[PDB]
Amino acid sequence: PAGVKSPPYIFSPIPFLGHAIAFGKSPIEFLENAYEKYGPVFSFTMVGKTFTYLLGSDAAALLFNSKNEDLNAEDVYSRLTTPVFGKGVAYDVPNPVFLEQKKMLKSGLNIAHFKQHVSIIEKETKEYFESWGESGEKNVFEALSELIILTASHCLHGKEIRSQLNEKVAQLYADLDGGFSHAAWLLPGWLPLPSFRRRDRAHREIKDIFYKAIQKRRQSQEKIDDILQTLLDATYKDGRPLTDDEVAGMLIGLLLAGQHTSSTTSAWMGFFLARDKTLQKKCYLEQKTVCGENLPPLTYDQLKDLNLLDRCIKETLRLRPPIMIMMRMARTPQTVAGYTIPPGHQVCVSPTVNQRLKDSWVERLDFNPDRYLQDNPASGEKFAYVPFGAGRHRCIGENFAYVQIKTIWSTMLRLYEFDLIDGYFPTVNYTTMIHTPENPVIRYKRRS
Amino acid sequence: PAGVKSPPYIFSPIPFLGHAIAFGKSPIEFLENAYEKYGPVFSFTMVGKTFTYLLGSDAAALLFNSKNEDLNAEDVYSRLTTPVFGKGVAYDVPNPVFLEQKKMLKSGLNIAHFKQHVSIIEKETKEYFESWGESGEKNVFEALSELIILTASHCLHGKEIRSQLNEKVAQLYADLDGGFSHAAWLLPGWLPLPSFRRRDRAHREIKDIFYKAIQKRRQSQEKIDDILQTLLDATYKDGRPLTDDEVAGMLIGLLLAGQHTSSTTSAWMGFFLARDKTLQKKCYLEQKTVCGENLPPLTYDQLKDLNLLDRCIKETLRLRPPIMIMMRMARTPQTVAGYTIPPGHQVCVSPTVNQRLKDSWVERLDFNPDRYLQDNPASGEKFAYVPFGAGRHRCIGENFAYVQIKTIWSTMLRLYEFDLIDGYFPTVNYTTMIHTPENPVIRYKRRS
Ligand SMILES: OC[C@H]1O[C@@H]2O[C@H]3[C@H](O)[C@@H](O)[C@@H](O[C@H]4[C@H](O)[C@@H](O)[C@@H](O[C@H]5[C@H](O)[C@@H](O)[C@@H](O[C@H]6[C@H](O)[C@@H](O)[C@@H](O[C@H]7[C@H](O)[C@@H](O)[C@@H](O[C@H]8[C@H](O)[C@@H](O)[C@@H](O[C@H]1[C@H](O)[C@H]2O)O[C@@H]8CO)O[C@@H]7CO)O[C@@H]6CO)O[C@@H]5CO)O[C@@H]4CO)O[C@@H]3CO
Ligand code: HEM
Ligand code: HEM
Structure with missing residues (x-):
């Protein structure tokens, strides 16, 4: 015991912003260079706050094993973020409660329901891309996100709600999250802020569609077994059932939480596959090898066996996780790689950086889905590959995501063959709140 | 292994000087406050250089056990310092050689010679203070240093040289060291500096007195057994004898090295004793108890048994060591209390601070020579009490010092009884190169 034995602090010459600019410009590069000079654990200032980063699996442990009362999640956010x-x-509630609601939702996303989803997803994907004609050059990112709002609406909300979803309602979801929670690092909690009228309005409006549908279901009670159901049935350790609000609130939350994350990932995979033409063909041939030369309507059980397409997703998520930072506020001192983190610091982990770390991953920056066949830190280490989180803090909708993407990409990979427009592989765009692919227009043509 | 894992660095708002002012104003206080905030090992800037301090016995180890090629002594000095x-x-020579010359000198300062010294010292002390009359108020510091130049000249140089020492020659010794080596911390090596004409002159002049006397001895070779002799006889692991210069050079060095150190200490003890009147009387009664009621001419063997007077010195040196910093330049990285000291840093230890450390010494700031009877860090720990240095780096003339002081103080304690002028206990004066007692005028009267 001595007093100051905290992680190395990187100084900035900009009094308040600190490193907010360098980080804002290119965070992964920033964080890598920092790892090289200061090791796995270090502090720095951004926009008045002190951030302490945990790099590599060993240190990343502290966050992944933490309790929300030592490393706090709600503390990280503003009314905006x-x-x-x-x-x-x-x-909007205490953690223990939130945890319970995630539980309820998790039990909603089960093998039973997934089986129903696969065919819905495939039908939607099929119908959507029909409008793409025989060939052309179009924005896959924009397509994928326009689609995923349909597919995920259907699977997670049920056909009553999905039927009500015209492009006027789709437009309202756009209003809902401008992606702001990804920007928490930049905007500190203390800032004065006006009401976000556009948001509060669309929420009110969308929430109202849910009331109308929670109505219809609670009346005629037939054989409908969807996520919506699971919820209505569910109750707390209370015994108390979910109010109508809670139901709509967590269902809206659920769709959004998965919306951008998925389209990011989907688009990125699309380009990785469009760049390595061999690999693309390969998991197209695996579509026949596994599913059968005639290409039947898709099923959940085939998905379990599309092992290349599975590694292509896994590998996409390694190089392009849609959630870049996981972030918690120190409320009680913590110990990591020798150091003590004082309460006050925002403790952070970067999926992107851990998954790319120069002394864990061979060929760090390479899109090689075969790497999971040899040795790798994915299995080798506890927390080197953590795109969905890890420990106590893991994404509830991990599995549905794999269902949704795999289906969509299968279906897509069937209808079309893809490649880059002029050898142009899309560059990362840090300028959107959630990192998007720069100019994600893709060339496609009918497959044979 | 990570890169920056050096001791905590204390920042200063003054770009070059850094802490030179705060330290210059009151170094012990500075260093204590620093220990409280940063622990036993910490860095800071003074006058362009980086100093790393080792506080407490455990860390002080690194310096005391070091080799001059890892922690360098010559690197610390300027032509001036x-x-x-x-x-x-x-x-002026490589370390190994210097070490050999210290050896030669050490074998010069032995039990045989000390026995001769005691009576010389006592005679000198007796003769000097005769001019003080029956009572008055006079500067003991000025007296003690005027005297010690006589006593130590006699003992260390021999009566040939001591006879040549009139106040014109004494004045030349004053010219020689203005005490500058104590200021090394303040004046860095890189400064441009003119020749120190006054010094170079007095050295030349004093050195010349030595030639004249090394002459006389090397001629008629009779029964004279003094330090001077030991030297002339001595030779290196070479077999090579000491040149005439080397002889004068190391003898001059020797006198100076002990000159100020001793008078500081002597004066301080004088005031400590003058403030605690009980204690003074007590070791005056111990003068009879041990030496005999009639008070014979003093001998070396009685000195060995004046155990209170011995602890009063020991205790004086604890609270007022004349050498405040021991200082070495890092030439190769070193490890202390977890940390790595990069080559470049001036690694430092403070006798004063170690000997006063708040969590080792009970009653830290108290003049209580009895503390060495109970438990204490003096014996308790390896390097808590290190006024003469320790490990490989210990003062060769430690013993002679105890001879000289003990004798002088005995003799003094006999002739007179002392006390403070108006309850005024002299305050430390950091303004002289070597820390002196502020306004060291003392009241004395004949003893009975
Ligand atoms: O003890 C303090 C400090 O010690 C630790 O820092 C270590 C670090 O790991 C190493 O890198 C190195 O430090 C060197 C550093 O790397 C170099 O860059 C350089 O530092 C210079 C800065 O680059 C430069 O910006 C400038 O600093 C100015 C600041 O920009 C400016 O903000 C202000 O300083 C005040 C600060 O505003 C404020 O933060 C406050 O600082 C305290 C911190 O809150 C707190 O983190 C802690 O700092 C530790 C740190 O945790 C360790 O990692 O205590 C701080 C007080 O010490 O107060 C400041 C008031 O001055 O203005 C300054 C200019 O004065 O200059 C610096 C250097 O001149 O050099 C560094 C060494 O030369 O080693 C250390 C080992 O301790
Ligand atoms: C595209 C791949 C996805 C990735 C990489 C991803 C990543 C993450 C991460 C890192 C977390 C935070 C874990 C924590 O700190 O507790 C999280 C939380 C969450 N995920 Fe996902 N996710 C993805 C898709 C989805 C999908 C499709 C859904 C919906 C079915 C979903 C629903 C949620 C919800 C409700 C949370 C909690 C939200 C919060 O606490 O703010 N996710 N996700
Ligand atoms: C009054 C009490 C004294 C104290 C507290 C004291 C303290 C010290 C210290 C701390 C050192 C440095 C040790 C090292 O780093 O190697 C030293 C060195 C030395 N001492 Fe003393 N000393 C005292 C008296 C004397 C006396 C009386 C003599 C002469 C007989 C003497 C001769 C020397 C010499 C020649 C050196 C080496 C000088 C150098 O390396 O610069 N000292 N002393």
């Missing part, structure tokens, strides 16, 4: 769910749900 | 010896001796 709070992830959108609803009143009385998620960040 | 170099301790004065002579050409071809001490800092």
Whole structure:
């Protein structure tokens, strides 16, 4: 015991902003260079706050094993940066409660339901891309996100709600999250802020569609077995059932939480595959090898066996995780790689950086889905590959994501063959709140 | 292994000087406050250089056990700050050689010679203070240093040289060291500096008195057994004898090295004793108890048994060591209390601070020579009480010092009884190069 034995602090010559600019410009590069000079654990200032980063699996442990009362999640957010769910749900309530609601939702996303989803997803994907004609050059990112709002609406909300979803309602979801929770690092909690009228309005409006549908279901009670159901049935350790709000709130939250994350990932995979033409063909041939030369309507059980397409996703998520930082506020001193983190610091982990770390991953920057066949830190280490989180803090909708993407990409990979427009592989765009692919226009043509 | 894992660095708002002012104003206080905030090992800037301090016995170890090629002694000095010896001796030569010359000198300061000294010292002390009359108020510091130049000249140089020492020659010794080596911390090596004409002159002049006397001895070779002799006889692991210069150089060096150190200490003890009147009387009664009621001419063997007077010195040296910093330059990385000291840093230890450390010494700031009877860090720990240095780096003339002081103080304690002028206990004066007692005028009267 001595006093100051905290992690090395990187100084900035810019009094308040600190490193906010360098980080804002290119965070992964920033964080890598920092690792090289200061090791696995270090502090620095951005926009008045002190951040302490945990790099590599060993140190990343502290966050992944933490309890929300030592390393706090709600503390990280502003009225603006709070992830959108609803009143009385998620960040609007105490953690223990939020945890319970995630439980309820998790039990909703099960093998039973997934089986129903696969065919819905495939039908939607099939119908959507019909409008793409025989060939052309179009924005896959924009397509994929326009689609995923349909597919995920259907699977997670049920056909009553999905039927009500015209492009006027789709437009309202766009209003809902401008992606702000990804920007929490930049905007500190203390800033004065006006009401976000556009958001609060669309929420009110969308929430109202849910009331109308929670109505219809609670009346005629037939054989409908969807996520919506699971929820209505569910109750707390209370015994108390979910109010109508809670139901809509956590369902809206759920769709959003998965919306951008998925389209990012989907588009990126699309380009990786379009760049390595061999690999693309290969998991197209695996479509026949596994599913059968005639290409039947898709099933959940085939998905379990599309092992290349599975590694292509896994590998996409390694090089392009849609959630770049996981972030918690120190409320009680913590010990990591020798150091003590004083309460006050925002403790952070970067999926992107851990998954790319120069002394763990061979060929760090390479899109090689075969790497998971040899040895790798994915299995080798506890927390080197953590795109969905890890320990106590893992994404509830991990599995649905794999269902949704795999289906969509299969279906897509069937209808079309893809490649880059002029050898142009899309560059990362840090300028959107959630990192998007720069100019994601893709060339496609009918497959044979 | 990570890169930056050096001791905590204390920042200063003054670009070059850094802490030179705060330290210059009151170094012990500075260093204590630093220990409280940063622990036993910490860095800071003074006058362009980086100093790393080792506080407490555990860390102080690194310096005391070091080798001059890892932690360098010559690197610490300027042409100005170099301790004065002579050409071809001490800092003017490589360390191994200097070490050999210290050896030669150490074997000179032995039990045989000490026995001769005691009576010389006592005679000198007796003769000197005769001019003080029956009572008055006079400067003991000025007296003690005027005297010690006589006593130590006699003992260390021999009566040939001591006879030549009139106040014109005494004045030349004053010219020799203005005490500058104590200021090394303040004046860095890189400064442009003119020749120190006054010094170089007095050295030349004093050195010349030595030639005349090395002459006389090397001629008629009779029964004279003094330190001077030991030297002339001595030779290196070479077999090579000491040149005439080397002899004068190391003898001059020797006298100076002990000159100020001793008078500081003597004066301080004088005031400690003058403030605690009980204690003074007590070791005056111990003068009879041990030496005999009639008070014979003093002998070496009685000195060995004046155990209170011995602890009063020991205790004086604890609270007022004349050498405040021991200082070495890192030439190869070193490890202390977890940390790595990069080559470049001036690694430092403070006798004063170690000997006062708040969590080792009970009653830290108290003049209580009895503390060495109970438990204490003096014996308790390896390097808590290190006024003469320790490990490989210990003062060769430690013993002679105890002889000289003990004798002088005995003799003094006999002739007179002392006390403070108006309850005024002299305050430390950091403004002289070597820390002196502020306004060291003392009241004395004949003893009975
Ligand atoms: O003890 C303090 C400090 O010690 C640790 O820092 C270590 C670090 O790991 C190493 O890198 C190295 O430090 C060197 C550093 O790397 C070099 O860059 C350089 O540092 C210079 C800066 O680059 C430069 O910007 C400038 O600093 C100015 C600041 O920009 C400016 O903000 C202000 O300083 C005040 C600060 O505003 C404020 O933060 C406050 O600082 C305290 C911190 O809150 C706190 O983190 C801690 O700092 C530790 C740190 O945790 C360790 O990692 O205590 C701080 C007080 O010490 O107060 C400041 C008031 O001055 O203005 C300054 C200019 O004065 O200059 C510096 C250097 O001149 O050089 C560094 C060494 O030369 O080693 C250390 C080992 O301790
Ligand atoms: C595209 C791949 C996805 C990735 C990489 C991803 C990543 C993450 C991460 C890192 C977390 C935070 C874990 C924590 O700190 O507790 C998280 C939380 C969450 N995920 Fe995902 N996710 C993805 C898709 C989805 C999908 C499809 C859904 C919906 C079915 C979903 C629903 C949620 C919800 C409700 C949370 C909690 C939200 C919060 O606490 O703010 N995710 N996700
Ligand atoms: C009054 C009490 C004294 C104290 C507290 C004291 C303290 C010290 C210290 C701390 C050192 C440095 C040790 C090292 O780093 O190697 C030293 C060196 C030395 N001492 Fe003393 N000393 C005292 C008296 C004397 C006396 C009386 C003599 C002469 C007989 C003497 C001769 C020397 C010499 C020649 C050196 C080496 C000088 C150098 O390396 O610069 N000292 N002393």
